[PDB]
Amino acid sequence: PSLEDLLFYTIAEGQEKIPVHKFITALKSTGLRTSDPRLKECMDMLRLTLQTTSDGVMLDKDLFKKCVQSNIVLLTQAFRRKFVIPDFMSFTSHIDELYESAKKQSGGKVADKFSPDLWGVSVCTVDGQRHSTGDTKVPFCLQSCVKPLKYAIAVNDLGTEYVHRYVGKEPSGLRFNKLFLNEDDKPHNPMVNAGAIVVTSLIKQGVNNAEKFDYVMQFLNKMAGNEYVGFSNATFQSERESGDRNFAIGYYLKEKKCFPEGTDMVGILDFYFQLCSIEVTCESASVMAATLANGGFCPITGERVLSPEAVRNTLSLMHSCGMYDFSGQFAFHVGLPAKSGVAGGILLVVPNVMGMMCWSPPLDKMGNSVKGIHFCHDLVSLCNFHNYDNLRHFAKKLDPRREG
Amino acid sequence: PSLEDLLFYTIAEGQEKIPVHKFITALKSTGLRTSDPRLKECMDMLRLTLQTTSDGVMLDKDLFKKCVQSNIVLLTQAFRRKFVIPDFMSFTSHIDELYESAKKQSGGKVADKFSPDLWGVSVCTVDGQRHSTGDTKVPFCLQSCVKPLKYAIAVNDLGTEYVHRYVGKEPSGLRFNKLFLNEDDKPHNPMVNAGAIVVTSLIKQGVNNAEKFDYVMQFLNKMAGNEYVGFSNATFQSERESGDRNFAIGYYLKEKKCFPEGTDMVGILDFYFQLCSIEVTCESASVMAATLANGGFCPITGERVLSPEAVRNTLSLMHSCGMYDFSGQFAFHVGLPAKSGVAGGILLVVPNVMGMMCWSPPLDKMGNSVKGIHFCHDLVSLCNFHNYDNLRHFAKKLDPRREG
Amino acid sequence: PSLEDLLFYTIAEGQEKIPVHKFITALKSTGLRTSDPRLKECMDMLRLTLQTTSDGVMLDKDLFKKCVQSNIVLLTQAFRRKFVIPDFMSFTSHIDELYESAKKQSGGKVADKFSPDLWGVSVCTVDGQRHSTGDTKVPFCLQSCVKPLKYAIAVNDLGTEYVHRYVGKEPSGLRFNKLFLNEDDKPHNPMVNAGAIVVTSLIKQGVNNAEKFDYVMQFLNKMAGNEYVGFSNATFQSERESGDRNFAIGYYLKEKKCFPEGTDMVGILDFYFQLCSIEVTCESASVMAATLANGGFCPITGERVLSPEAVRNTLSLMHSCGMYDFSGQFAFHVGLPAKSGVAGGILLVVPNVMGMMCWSPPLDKMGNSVKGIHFCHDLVSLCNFHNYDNLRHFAKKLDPRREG
Amino acid sequence: PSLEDLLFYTIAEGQEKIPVHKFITALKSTGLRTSDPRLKECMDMLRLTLQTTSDGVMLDKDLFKKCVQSNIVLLTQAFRRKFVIPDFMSFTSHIDELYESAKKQSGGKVADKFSPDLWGVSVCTVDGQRHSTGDTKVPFCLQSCVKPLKYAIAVNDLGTEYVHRYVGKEPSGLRFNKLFLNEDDKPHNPMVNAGAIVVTSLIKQGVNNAEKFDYVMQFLNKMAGNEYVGFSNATFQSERESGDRNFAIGYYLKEKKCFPEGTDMVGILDFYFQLCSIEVTCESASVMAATLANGGFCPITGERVLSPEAVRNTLSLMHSCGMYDFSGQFAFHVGLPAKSGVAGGILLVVPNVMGMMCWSPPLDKMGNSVKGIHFCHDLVSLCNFHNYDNLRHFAKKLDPRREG
Ligand SMILES: O=C(Cc1ccccc1)Nc1nnc(NC2CCN(c3nnc(NC(=O)Cc4ccccc4)s3)CC2)s1
Ligand SMILES: O=C(Cc1ccccc1)Nc1nnc(NC2CCN(c3nnc(NC(=O)Cc4ccccc4)s3)CC2)s1
């Protein structure tokens, strides 16, 4: 028995000692990055023993074991390739190829502000492995990408039954999106502005709007492994000064008695416009994506955020309702819960595998980003990620969950 | 190396002989039934050597070794619990459990002539394991349960592009449950009578309703591993006596030129009413369902009935379009590709696991077996088969893909 | 006392005699044609006394009088200007102008078979007065101009109450061009093919379709004062081999139990196809209009064809449901109960004044004669015939019911 | 020649003087009211000459002459029975008969605060004749009865075509009591809250909401010959707190840029609710009804309030878009342009005859006054007033424009 030192020999070719860069690149290549929270101890003790000399440094089998003792369990499976993507290093080189192939899709137009050449993809597997290519550190607002996230919080806190005494669950229709309420005098489902507004009103009833936004922020922090979540006051005041269509939905719901008892209607939209201006980066948000890919458990902190009840329902509804009018075709050709917003954002989710976020600000005639859409077609072109692809017989596709 | 030897003292607890019945009881336990067609070489050579006596009797390691030499490769994984559901024997206790609960469900009306207290459930898994409780050998007609099966057949010959020149992919909306076409003047999706009637028009073009029907009985024969795929001539006389509405759908489609050039609209309804009266049993139809579970390869034969393109698209559309108006709620609360039929049938698929078929002739108001539906809420309640359940963190549900 | 003498001097120069050519042109100017059936006795007894002489003839006080005694009261009204239009002579010169400017309206496609330059108008007041300009004696088919007339027959024989157990009375709304039934499973109104078809099932249930057609033709004779009503077997069967849309409606109404029991659905369609192919001309159909403009009484025979009950409902429903999708605009700018026909027909009715029929085969985007459409707009642009024009304060429009 | 003399010998029995209190009942016989404003000079000059006595007393040929010298032209017609309804005395009994038969229908509920047994009916003919039985002097609010009047004021100022850039001219469809705009992003007609609100947005554009109201209040007073057109500030303060539905409409309208340039969406709604709060009595409002029966001229004054273009369009749209969802059924069985509101009122117009107002506060289940609705059926069953009743042959109904 000797678990920590079995990885020393695995990195030290039956050898004297190893430099630390040789451990660092043999850890940067496992997908993981030196920044993983679950890796903090081990990474701390390397910041320590590097200052031990001004040497290499170079690690003993006991000096090594002293840093990796802490996180040894998720360290072995990284170097014993027990991650849901074993060969993470090649699978990035196609993400880069799918990125540059999609880089030339020129058509589209922004809404009305960013510059129309920006284009980033970022990836986070249900285990931690990360990759980014292109402009993945530039912030943008979620906008409607938040609609799944706040729906989860709501059923997380209330339960399916209560949450669905006020909103329905099926998709609208392709020329039935102009309506607000369904036959039961409830909104169609929580991915349309009509039902997203009734769900924004169930979140912590009895408390006020300053406090409520914190509560969401602390949920959304947990889902993103405490990576970047921000807030444009800018796009907030634009959102509440052009949201005429949204005030419309507001008053209709007040009269048809669709809000819970004693809901300051105007308080609730004010909140909603805030929620849409929350900022993220590509990298920030792929973690949020991967929290849903992972049953309500953040992949880079192991902290459980979302009841599974909540994760199931949010994914069922991103499937049918998440691309606006394109979701029926999306759920057909790509067949992945996804959620686009008008920023260029697609909160792609590959259940039990990984999580993504794409960003090109040029949008198409339906409200989806041009390069964003194209990408997902080429991604499920290549690998058997479509929800009803077979994991055993998948013809000429590539399953990154296997090796060789 | 001794692969046929490896299994001898795996059934023979270090003993020298094995009673044949102790081996086959060790095989009935695997779920497989002694009549598997990938097992017949082994079964033929078993009855050969067992008439080389008539006393007991037993098999030595030299004798067992050329019975099961034939189909060792899958006889190994049967006995090495390398099948999708390893402890198949306790899973069936729950299928019995939920069966006997759904028996007490008394409501529903029979359509119109069967007896109301009929009720049977049958499983076949992606590897071939079978179970059947209750009345699962009485035969009924698929009715609309045929509508996915023909859709696949079209795409496996014509391709996804051509076939969706002629029938959309979205679901309609409980408001559009009695419009026929969509904005682009195609029917909404192949699971509604209007869409059925147009896919039937694309099969085996240039050929008459005799060879056409036979080419769909043969194809359905492949899918079911050559189990009972029959035909009621009785139904097809009165489905055409009282099919006033379907003549309504057919002429409207002809008016709008929804068929490929040169389609006998009256004959295609004839073909269609035929396909609706193909008989199956619970038992035979669960192999059809499991064939789609399994990448288009028939589990109990090994042959490749369907291209993977075609099994994928059938499963996409069953999900969203498969349960008349209950589709919306079914994809929420049960989240499985299912399909319902006016006679009590539910052709249920659990992709990459298994394939079911339930049957109780009393429907509810919406057209789905009362006992049928009840059962499928309970099956997802107990087990993590919901399409968007999590395969690692699934709360207190039972995963049958696991041991322990 | 001597009313027949009063006419003698009122036409003669207070002189001599009367020449007869100046009696008939004194009569042709009052509107009436020598053909009027209320004038045959008069017309007869002059066709006699002019086989007497071989020169003039000129009638004396006594000879004049015995021709006109039998229709003295009708013939006094013409020359004492007690007709609904007194100065018919000038009213027609405007009809020619309105027909002339409408001559040069360019576009339009004829449906598919005639010639695109055909154009005639014909008019007949509630009192018998007739005018026609252009191609007014070429036969064409009513097509959907027939739907009011058979509605009239049905309610006249069965009553408002019974009839409207099977068809509704409101219009549909412009998005509902494509539905067949209102919410109560009844076709919206009797001017859409679905309600028409149901009207024709009520017309003398229980008698065969050879006898049924005779009845209608008899009724359609009583309405044209026994002028030209024909039937082209040529369009009747081209309307049969292309009526795909109508068989659609047929079966839908069969299935929804929208006919009286005993109705042979397919028979009723042939009846309907028959009626659509009835031939009329501009001239002969302007009298049928005038029968309805006249409270049930044919204006050239004084017979009571239709109960008033039946005449009221037909003009109600023509008003709102009469011009396909254009009825809303037509009922606004024109405001006369009309009914268009794909042949080029418009069956106009100015109640208590006159009936007309226009014909040019070029139709517009909505299926309504191009020159036909333009003419009405102009005619009501010039006379205060709009249903909600005032008869006292009508600004700059011309009232033909008043002299000077 | 003896203009004024002629009517002295008419009322006095070839006798000396005529007692004045019987000339006044000779004039109350004619339906006219001694307070008729076209009769003030006659009534003043008459007040003089009886205080030039304190006698009985009576009137000579020359004392009668310089009293009615003034308004002889309508005093002659009032006694020569040249009014629209010659035997007004008998007519009023059937108004009482139809009144107290409508008084026993106990059905209905008020909305919310009045008393359910208020029942008031008031008639004004296009000549000025008046009658009023029951609670015809109790004030209530126009409510939607405002929409026609508001529409006319619009079109009389800006003309058909401008006003119909911002509102169409068709009814809805019983299903589309719900949608706001139509296929051209305009509200349907101006008789539903959607178009009423936009119509409001075109009265005196640019001027603020204080002059706007006083502009339509000076316009309603003209239309009612300066009888009681009040304003309940009470209901307005409530109509503005429960008007959630109307706020929904307004915001949606701002979204689709359906108002004209520079419209303050929120002041326009305030204006609207004011327009609904305007007060009238049965008697006050029955004179507005008559002003539209009279091509835009107030009967009891004689001024030209509305362009004829403006009152034709208004009467068109009340015909069809008049009584909410009953309007089609109303336009069938009653076929009279009418407008109902939530207060218990029906604004009835009988073109070229009279105008009316009914009032029972109990509405039925469609927003229309119960005793009101009953009365109007009774009245067209009684009299030939129906839009498409024939004026010559009208079977067993009564005609009040003919004597006997
Ligand atoms: O008009 C157009 C353009 C258009 C129209 C037609 C064709 C093509 C183009 N766009 C529109 N923008 N906003 C519109 N109105 C919404 C719908 C009405 N209200 C309602 N929302 N949901 C109801 N639903 C039930 O009230 C319950 C129910 C639904 C269906 C069936 C039965 C019951 S109303 C809320 C507002 S419309
Ligand atoms: O519904 C009721 C009674 C009802 C109504 C309301 C409430 C409750 C009860 N009866 C009916 N059952 N079926 C009806 N329609 C027929 C079948 C489908 N139709 C059509 N097929 N495709 C269209 N669509 C485009 O042709 C393209 C298009 C789509 C949307 C908008 C514009 C254009 S209609 C053609 C006729 S009617």
Residue numbers in the entry:
A (entry chain D), B (entry chain B), C (entry chain A), D (entry chain C): 137 to 248, 255 to 546
Sentences from the paper on this structure:
The serial room temperature crystal structure that was solved for the GAC-UPGL00004 complex was largely similar to the corresponding high-pressure cryo-cooled structure, with the two inhibitor molecules bound to the GAC tetramer exhibiting the same cup-shaped orientation routinely observed in the cryo-cooled structure for this complex. By contrast, both molecules of UPGL00004 bound to GAC in the room temperature X-ray structures adopted the more typical cup-shaped orientation within the binding site. This supports the idea that UPGL00004 is held rigidly in the allosteric binding site of GAC, whereas BPTES, even when bound to the enzyme, has a significant degree of conformational flexibility. In this case, the ring-to-ring distance is 18.5 Å, which is significantly larger than the distances between the rings in either the cryo-cooled structure (14.4 Å) or for the UPGL0004 molecule (14.6 Å in the cryo-cooled structure and 14.7 Å in the room-temperature structure).
